[PDB]
Amino acid sequence: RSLKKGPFIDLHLLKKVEKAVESGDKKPLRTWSRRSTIFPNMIGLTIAVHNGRQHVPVFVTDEMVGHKLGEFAPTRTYR
Amino acid sequence: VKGGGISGQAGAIRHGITRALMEYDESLRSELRKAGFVTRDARQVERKKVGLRKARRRPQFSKR
Amino acid sequence: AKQSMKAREVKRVALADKYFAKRAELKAIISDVNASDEDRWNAVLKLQTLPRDSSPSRQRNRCRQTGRPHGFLRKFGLSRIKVREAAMRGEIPGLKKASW
Amino acid sequence: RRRVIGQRKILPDPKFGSELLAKFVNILMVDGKKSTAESIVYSALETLAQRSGKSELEAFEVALENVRPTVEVKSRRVGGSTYQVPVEVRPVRRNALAMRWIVEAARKRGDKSMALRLANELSDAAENKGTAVKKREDVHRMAEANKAFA
Amino acid sequence: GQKVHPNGIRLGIVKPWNSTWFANTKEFADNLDSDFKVRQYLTKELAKASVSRIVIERPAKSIRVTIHTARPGIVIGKKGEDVEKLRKVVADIAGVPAQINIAEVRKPELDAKLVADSITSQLERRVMFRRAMKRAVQNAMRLGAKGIKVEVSGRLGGAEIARTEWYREGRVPLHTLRADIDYNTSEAHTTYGVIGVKVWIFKGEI
Amino acid sequence: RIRIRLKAFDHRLIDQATAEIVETAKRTGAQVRGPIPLPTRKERFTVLISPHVNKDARDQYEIRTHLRLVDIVEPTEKTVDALMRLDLAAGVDVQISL
RNA sequence: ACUAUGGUUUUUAUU
RNA sequence: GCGAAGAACCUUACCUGGUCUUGACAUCCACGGAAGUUUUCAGAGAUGAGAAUGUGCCUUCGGGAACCGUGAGACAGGUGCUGCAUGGCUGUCGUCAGCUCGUGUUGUGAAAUGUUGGGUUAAGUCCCGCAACGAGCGCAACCCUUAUCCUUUGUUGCCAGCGGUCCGGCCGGGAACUCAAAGGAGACUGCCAGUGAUAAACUGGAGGAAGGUGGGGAUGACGUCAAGUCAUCAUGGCCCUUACGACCAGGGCUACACACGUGCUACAAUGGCGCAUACAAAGAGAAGCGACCUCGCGAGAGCAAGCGGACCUCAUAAAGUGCGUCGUAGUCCGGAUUGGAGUCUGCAACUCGACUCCAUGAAGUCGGAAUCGCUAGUAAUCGUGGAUCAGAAUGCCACGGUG
């Protein structure tokens, strides 16, 4: 029941996963678009997302997949 | 009669009657003047100052 | 008001000239409540999903003598803080103050 | 101050020729519709003959000759200070003051039909009990213990 | 203190506009924007050609301009043909072919713009500042009129304050709506300042 | 048949143009009636006319568009050729119609 | 039957 | 509720991370290209690299110029600081009756006099009078406009007169209450009474459509508030000028553990609802407003006329009038919140849009000390329209009904 039968998507972040699973102990993969959807094959990865003044880490779970990335991260201050 | 509301039509008809009724007999010509029915009533705009909300109320004023 | 706001809008109107100008009803040959679920008009959609810098939004009329967006009077191209000057300086036909 | 004003005495009712009935429908006028009020007051006698109303010569006079208001209360300044002082009711509101005391008592009552609430309020004035008749008495009993100022 | 533009408050008494053309409700904002910039550009091209006032008209998909000058011979110029380059660019900022007309001013030192360049050219040539106006007034009342006011601001001391000087002759007039005046405001930019000048000329009611 | 859409923003400018086109028609021998004046069309607004806030300073302005049609009923051609290239008072617009 | 408490600085003289 | 009347990317004053600064805007000089149109690929994207499409203008036939995309040198530009510096631009004491000067007089003199006094006015307005007599600015008068009659020109508005009578202003035709337009008269305290130095001047009356600064517009004498604004401009000073430049992918400006205004609508039964039933007025609208017709309970989407202004569209005017019915139950009233299913414009409908229908429906007893506003077509009450406006305010500017 999402807006139109066709979803609006870009594969620009999905194309990074097969390299982000070999990063070692380096700081997580960083992104700025928050309207982006999270596909089921993105599960088990740490991503750094913009909170409005810095970037903070989130881990992809069975609750985050099939939804947008911005729905799982903070957007405001006083916390 | 045509145009206006029925209370406005009464304002047209009541003087259209006297413009005929004063010819109907010489003994009515003084009597309709003694009652004030042979003349146009003195009402005319009366339209709001620039800009009052609706006729009056200086919109959110109440000042002093 | 930064001078880029109008200098970019004139370039976007020139770009709408291939996508929307006499083409804003062109969706009327691809819109349908069902269409038997077939596909035969995607030749239109390939070009309606192509532009990003041209859109039915992102425009502000402004004043033709000041970059300010608000206080504007469309049919003169001037502002509510410019027409009372122009109508006393004699710079505009049809418009006058007082008498009447 | 200046003025000295023009005043209005209003048109009579178009069925009965009564200007007292005209002032009653004006005090009964809400939302400016004015034709609605004609259908609420003097629109039945069968609802007054249901309670205390005896013969049609009293079907409206129970709000007119049945009472005489004289004073209103509140405070007034005399010299450098303010005191509670009964003031002399004006001679043309004299006969139209109890109209509000009946219309308010019926309008604010929770008992459905407004045409029947008004006929029941007129019946409760025809017995000379409680509403409107005690709003006359309360201020007269006050003014019988307050006489030094006018 | 309360005040209004003295020609613009009188414009509602039978006078035409100096921008006098027609346009449709959607093209009007564009036809007005071209009217402003031809009046600007042309009065700058002629800034040393003794010009007073301008009037804009529109023939069928063309533009027509009349300019008033006290030296028509230098505006029509070399062989009486040196006008093509003076219509050439007003046609390029109006988007339509341009047409020229020149008008002669026949009592020049009685025009509200040319008397203001005359007193500018006396303040430039270092006359007594608080007395400069008496020459321009004498020379104007020699040409016609019922009354005149020309007001100077700056360099009138003594102390350097908001002082203004003009002197009384006939009527200004401060009001009379049908006064049928001639009006202008100018700045001389002389004497290390701006030296603000204003002039009102009265010839009689309507 | 011909009509001539003569339009202006001033009630005297259109009378001073009528006094040129209808006189040219009569002097060129055209068979013509009294031309209709038409109901006036208006544009109006009330706006805040002060340069920065001062909320009391709201004032009303209006402008009026006048139109006449002239209307020639007769099919005669030579009598009306004198109108189509004729000069009228500055600021009026003309368009020819049926 | 009456309210203590908000300091301090300003201009025309020339022809 | 004032501007800031329209905050998803935007707009927009700014932050995270990118990227490029003779720059958004103007020429002089320099190089390969017409201006322009498309397609393939990397990058968050801006953008960058290939391959096609076309070869305009001038052509002393010499080869050249607009212009594109860029690089110099002159230069750009600033919600950078500032309305006790100045123009501009707008307000207020204030359309108030205020403000002074010459001659003559007076006082040692600064300075007074007139301008105070009497009767008055819209008013230093007008008459009367003295050691004052006269003059001017503001005022008065004069201006734009309104109620009414006479006279004239008329449409696809109107139908009186006079003809036809698809029986309909639908036509011949016309200018009759009207309507749309114009022209001429009309008002002056002049006319009459009462009052008062039969002075000035006032309240009524007669005429008349109607006065007595009629009502509405509209001008601003010296003096005020160093009035308001550099976030709308010009221009000097101070500052910047690879930056405070400003384009991308995210986004900010609906903050918030916290105090307070102001406004709207109910609580019902002079109410709620349906059917029957009557009158609008002013606006707006050509890739527009969109009729009749269709699918769906519907948002809305199709079919397909009319209309650029009085033969159309938006658009059966509503409150009201008539009739039946529910009836204190914290109620089919009346409203917050909510599940499911749909309708729409848009890169985009997370954060962060509007609209419709089933399913669920909490409060609400007409408000207490106290405080706020309106004087007649004024209060109150119901409906129509538009600007801003992809799509989205209840705010706002106008037009009518009831009273």
Order of helices and strands of chain B: HH
Number of separate helices of chain C: 3
Number of domains of chain C: 1
Structural class of chain B: mainly alpha
Give a count of the beta strands of chain B, DSSP E runs of length 2 or more. 0
Estimate what percentage of residues of chain B fall within beta strands: under 5%
Shape of chain C: elongated
Q: Specify Rg of chain C, calculated over alpha carbons.
A: 21 Å
N to C succession of SSEs of chain C: HHEEH
Describe the sheet with the most strands of chain C: 2 strands, antiparallel
Structural class of chain C: mainly alpha
State the oligomer.
Answer: part of a larger assembly
Helix content of chain C: 25-40%
The rough form of chain B would be described as: elongated
Overall helicity of chain B: 40-55%
Report the total helices of chain B: 2
Q: Please give the radius of gyration of chain B in angstroms.
A: 19 Å
For the terminal residues of chain B, how far apart are their CA atoms? 51 Å
GO molecular function, one term (chain B): tRNA binding
Subunit structure (chain B): Part of the 30S ribosomal subunit. Contacts 16S rRNA. Cross-links to the P site tRNA and weakly to the A site tRNA.
Keywords (chain B): Ribonucleoprotein, Ribosomal protein, RNA-binding, tRNA-binding
Family (chain B): Belongs to the universal ribosomal protein uS9 family.
Descriptive labels:
part of a larger assembly, 6 chains, A: 79 residues, mainly beta, 1 helix, globular, C: mainly alpha, two-stranded antiparallel sheet, 3 helices, 2 strands, 27% helix, elongated, ribosome, cryo-EM refinement, tRNA, translocation intermediate
Describe this structure in words.
The structure is cut from a larger assembly and holds chains A (79 residues), B (64 residues), C (100 residues), D (150 residues), E (206 residues) and F (98 residues). Helix content of chain A is 5%, strand content 16%. Chain A has one helix at 17-20, and strands spanning 29-31, 46-50, 55-59. In chain A, strand 2 and strand 3 (55-59) form a beta hairpin. Chain A is globular. The longest helix of chain B is centred in the first third of the chain and has 19 residues, at 6-24. Chain B has helices spanning 6-24, 29-35. Helix content of chain B is 41%, strand content 0%. Chain C has one domain. Chain C is 27% helix and 4% strand. In chain C, a hairpin with a 4-residue loop joins strand 1 and strand 2 (78-79). With 150 residues, chain D is α+β, with helices and mostly antiparallel strands. Chain D has 5 helices and 4 strands, in the order H-H-E-E-E-E-H-H-H. In chain D, the strands form 2 sheets. Chain D has a two-stranded antiparallel sheet with strand order 1-4. Chain D has a two-stranded antiparallel sheet with strand order 2-3. Chain D starts with 18 loop residues before the first helix and ends in a 7-residue tail after the last helix. Chains C and E meet through helix 3 of C and helix 1 of E. Chain C binds 2 RNA strands through helix 1. Chain A: Part of the 30S ribosomal subunit. Binds S13 and L5 and cross-links to the A site tRNA. Chain A: InterPro entries: Ribosomal_uS19 (IPR002222), Ribosomal_uS19_bac-type (IPR005732), Ribosomal_uS19_CS (IPR020934), Ribosomal_uS19_SF (IPR023575). Chain A: Belongs to the universal ribosomal protein uS19 family. Chain A: Keywords: Ribonucleoprotein, Ribosomal protein, RNA-binding, rRNA-binding, tRNA-binding. Chain A: One of its GO terms (cellular component) is cytoplasm.
